[PDB]
Amino acid sequence: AADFQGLYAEVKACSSELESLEMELRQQILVNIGKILQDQPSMEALEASLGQGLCSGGQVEPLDGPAGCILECLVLDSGELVPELAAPIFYLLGALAVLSETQQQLLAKALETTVLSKQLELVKHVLEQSTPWQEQSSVSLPTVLLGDCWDEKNPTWVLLEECGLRLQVESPQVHWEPTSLIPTSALYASLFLLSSLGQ
């Protein structure tokens, strides 16, 4: 029953308040998400602080390092969370947690460059083009988004292979399997929300 319309609507709705966040706080969050993507205990610490703050409504205790730089953007001066900002960040952290360490590290690298939009466009294409998701099928990828060298060393290849997708060099490059829906959906949600912060 899941489809791309449902996935897009959910991620789009979750993104609204990040896209309308002021530029300076968006960049502070995004740069520091890039650092905690390389430091899983920091992501878990941030998730623990935001989850308890969202559900309790109480004062949130400051964190150290890059996780703390993110949290500072999400709290009032009294220390309670701004729920409209903490909730989408918690949703993003939940999506990132679905992904493997390898994918998390690749996302951290992509943030710094134009690569992020291209990977979002590619993952969106895989999900749109593989409708109906419950049928195994082949998907062609636009060669222009694949970079200079398309093979098992390419970051987009690894990102997709880590979703459980079987990949090959020649078109159609992606073999879609329904069991890859959950990780690929999380990868899309992650790229989409990271892109909404980077605009």
DSSP output for 62-120: ---HHHHHHHHTTB-TTSBB-HHHHHHHHHHHHHHHHS-HHHHHHHHHHTTSTHHHHHH
Burial of 170 (0-12, 13-18, 19+ CB in 10 A): exposed
Q: What is the resolution of this structure in A?
A: 1.8
Letter for the amino acid at 42?
S
Q: Which helix (H) or strand (E) holds 166?
A: strand 166-167
**Helix, strand, or coil (residue 127):** helix
d(CA 172, CA 192): 24
Other beta carbons less than 10 A from residue 191's beta carbon: 24
d(CA 2, CA 186): 13
Per the structure, the count of domains in the chain is 1
Helical axes 4-19 vs 83-98, angle rounded to 10°: 130
Question: Cβ(11)–Cβ(192) under 8 Å?
Answer: yes
The whole domain housing 91 covers 1-199
Alpha carbons within 13 A on the beta-carbon side of 6: 8
Question: Cβ(21)–Cβ(198) under 8 Å?
Answer: no
Burial of 149 (0-12, 13-18, 19+ CB in 10 A): exposed
Length of the chain: 199
d(CA 168, CA 195): 27
d(CA 94, CA 96): 5
Q: Which helix (H) or strand (E) holds 138?
A: strand 137-139
Letter for the amino acid at 104?
Q
C-alpha of 156 from chain center: 14
Q: Which of 21, 101, 34 is nearest to 66 (CA)?
A: 34
